[PDB]
């Protein structure tokens, strides 16, 4: 009986909530009350990368911390040398409605996808003078919201159908499907160990997934509204979640619950994008209002604002060396930021 | 002053920027359109008629390129997505117009009113004008002439509603058909006029299932949308 199964699900939800509350020994704010504040993080736009015609919808940094891919709904996937502002590639997409792109850790490939329901994989190191499609991963039944390479052969993808999939790029097939979400999956972040990933969805839950087992380890459900953006904390033991509810929230895998929430009453715009700084001390969040707020991830206070955009910040990524944060926006500009001594 | 590798990188950047200039020209000369409508709406017959007259099963987006005079139109039909649209619809913030096709003959059209209200009031789709194709006008004519279903059962306002003197009926259509047509239109216009505040406009059109005028209708009211945008940025409207 579904009524009895619903009652058992309520019983297990109560048991889980009780186990969470038993682990709430003390809050993060209490533990970090006596750590020194981050202070005012002023950052300057060191580069404005201009050349996209439409709104930029996604970014990814290369592991080299120099090359940056950005996807715009004009149907150009542009690869930028951040140091020089030079455009290294501009790839004509077969569908303009790109919503995600990924840079492979090897730099050999970029992926992108969107309303085509396809993750197109682009070989950047062909003998040809221009980039070619290596593979078109065609099994999703909704829009590609995020994609992230595990390796040159494996890409995790998230979709508007409430499902992630792990793809073998050489075979072109789903090695695994991640089905437990109940709304549009909006964001992925791969753990640093690459074995776990967390995906946030319109259900307002985040879920932890094992790429090898194909199963949900944990569901995190503190958010009120759609989790537009998710980012692993660099230790791999916590992750931040941005939502339409205008809050970020920090979840720890092992505490199985919200450590902290980042919100200000003046912030009524949903979170579009989240990234940590290399130490994890800064949570950079992009907003529907044209700002990125830098949060002290330990103290939950606003260390600063990246105020340089003229439309919705769409994507936000810190280099793997932590040296710069790029910020794409619907203003078609791709602003790259760093501090000063 | 550049090293030979920096020189070759700048030369590649310049060739890419030249290609991006050419694609800026092609892109900015194209009117992008989002085609919305319930499965009962003849939006499929609209894409079919325009695909014929002018210019992978998981594929979540269908593009039909069509051309009117020299203006290129790319019209996008969102096919293989889920019923939840609130995220993917945000992609279309930039489109010149949304073509919202309504099955005027099916009094399920209160769902079409609710979808129109949502599209019209969304924070990312305000400033986008809606080309409202009140389709299946022939089926609506048959439906109201047969009299087996009556709009006041679905909209109590229709018992009071009187046809506006602005109405320009076809010479042969019955005044009951006109009153039904313009009531449906005026419900969509009620939604459009509640909250547009002049940032975006609704363009009702009465279309038959196949009606070759529709591409001209979209051309005319795209030209009107672009004129209104220009007048707005000149502060003249």
């Amino acid at each position, epitope marked *: 009986e579904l009524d009895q199964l619903r009652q058992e699900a309520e019983q297990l939800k109560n048991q889980i909530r009780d186990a969470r509350k038993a682990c709430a020994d003390a809050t993060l704010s209490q533990i970090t009350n006596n750590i020194d504040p981050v202070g005012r993080i002023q950052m300057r736009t060191r580069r404005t990368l201009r050349g996209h015609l439409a709104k930029i919808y996604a970014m990814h940094w290369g592991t080299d911390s120099r090359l940056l891919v950005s996807a715009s709904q004009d149907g150009k996937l542009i690869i930028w040398d951040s140091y020089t502002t030079n455009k290294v590639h501009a790839i004509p997409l077969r569908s303009s409605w790109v919503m995600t792109c990924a840079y492979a850790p090897s730099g050999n490939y970029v992926a992108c996808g969107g309303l085509d329901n396809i993750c197109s994989i682009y070989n950047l190191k062909t003998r040809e003078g221009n980039v070619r499609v290596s593979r078109e991963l065609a099994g999703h039944t909704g829009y590609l919201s995020c994609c992230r390479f595990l390796d040159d052969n494996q890409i995790v993808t998230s979709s508007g159908d409430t499902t992630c999939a792990l793809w073998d790029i050489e075979t072109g097939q789903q090695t695994t499907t991640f089905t437990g979400h*109940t709304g549009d999956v909006m964001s992925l972040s791969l753990a640093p160990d690459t074995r776990l990933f967390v995906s946030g969805a*319109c259900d*307002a839950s985040a879920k932890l997934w094992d790429v090898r087992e194909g199963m949900c380890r944990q569901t995190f*459900t503190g958010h009120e509204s759609d989790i537009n953006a998710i980012c692993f904390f660099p230790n791999g033991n916590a992750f931040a979640t941005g939502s339409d*509810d205008a809050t970020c929230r920090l979840f720890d895998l092992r505490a199985d619950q919200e450590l902290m929430t980042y919100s200000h009453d003046n912030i*009524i715009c949903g979170i579009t994008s989240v990234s940590f700084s290399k130490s994890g001390r800064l949570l950079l969040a992009g907003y529907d209002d044209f700002n990125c707020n830098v949060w002290d991830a330990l103290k939950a206070d606003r260390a600063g604002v990246l105020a340089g955009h003229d439309n919705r910040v769409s994507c936000l990524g810190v280099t793997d060396d932590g040296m710069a944060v790029a910020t794409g926006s619907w203003d078609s500009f791709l602003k790259i930021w760093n501090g000063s001594s | 002053t550049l090293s030979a590798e920096d020189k070759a990188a700048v030369e590649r950047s310049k060739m890419i920027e030249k290609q991006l200039q050419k694609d800026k020209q092609v892109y900015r000369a194209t009117h992008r359109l989002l085609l919305l409508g319930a499965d009962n709406s003849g939006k499929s017959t609209i894409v079919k008629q325009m695909r014929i007259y002018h210019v992978v099963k998981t594929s979540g987006i269908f593009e039909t390129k069509f051309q009117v005079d020299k203006v290129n139109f790319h019209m996008f039909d969102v096919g293989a997505q889920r*019923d939840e649209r*609130r995220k993917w619809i945000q992609c279309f913030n930039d489109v010149t117009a949304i073509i919202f096709v309504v099955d005027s003959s099916d009094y399920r059209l209160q769902e079409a009113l609710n979808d129109f209200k949502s599209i019209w009031n969304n924070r990312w789709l305000r400033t986008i004008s809606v080309i409202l194709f009140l389709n299946k006008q022939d089926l609506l004519a048959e439906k109201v002439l047969a009299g087996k279903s009556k709009i006041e059962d679905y909209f109590p306002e229709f018992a009071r509603y009187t046809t506006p003197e602005d109405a320009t009926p076809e010479p042969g259509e019955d005044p009951r058909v006109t009153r039904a047509k313009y009531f449906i239109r005026d419900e969509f216009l009620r939604i459009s006029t509640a909250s547009g505040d002049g940032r975006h406009y609704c363009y009702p059109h009465f279309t038959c299932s196949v009606d070759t005028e529709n591409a001209r209708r979209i051309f005319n009211d795209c030209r009107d949308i672009i004129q209104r945008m220009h007048l707005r940025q000149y502060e003249l409207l």
Partner: nanobody
Amino acid sequence: QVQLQESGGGLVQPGGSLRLSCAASGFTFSNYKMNWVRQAPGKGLEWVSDISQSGASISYTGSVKGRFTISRDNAKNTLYLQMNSLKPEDTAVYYCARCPAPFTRDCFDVTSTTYAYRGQGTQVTV
């Protein structure tokens, strides 16, 4: 977590009256526009009424306009539907559906075949 729990639905004589009530938990209810949505057994899911953050804006379907009133007690995080003069047309599972985002009026997806911010629904038979 976001859970919506409708109550008060049951059998009623035609022309009878029921107050449905949803207890909302896990969100700042005051910030979200609220809806009632119903699925009659023979047809798809259909919207019924909506209420703004304050109740300053309210609307209904034409089946409902005079018969039902939607109201909210933001202090009790609870939404009501005073269904007067129920007809056999009104027999449906009634679902209370939150809007997706706070501070907004776009009402998207509340009628979707699956939607996260909607309760399990209360059966009303007339």
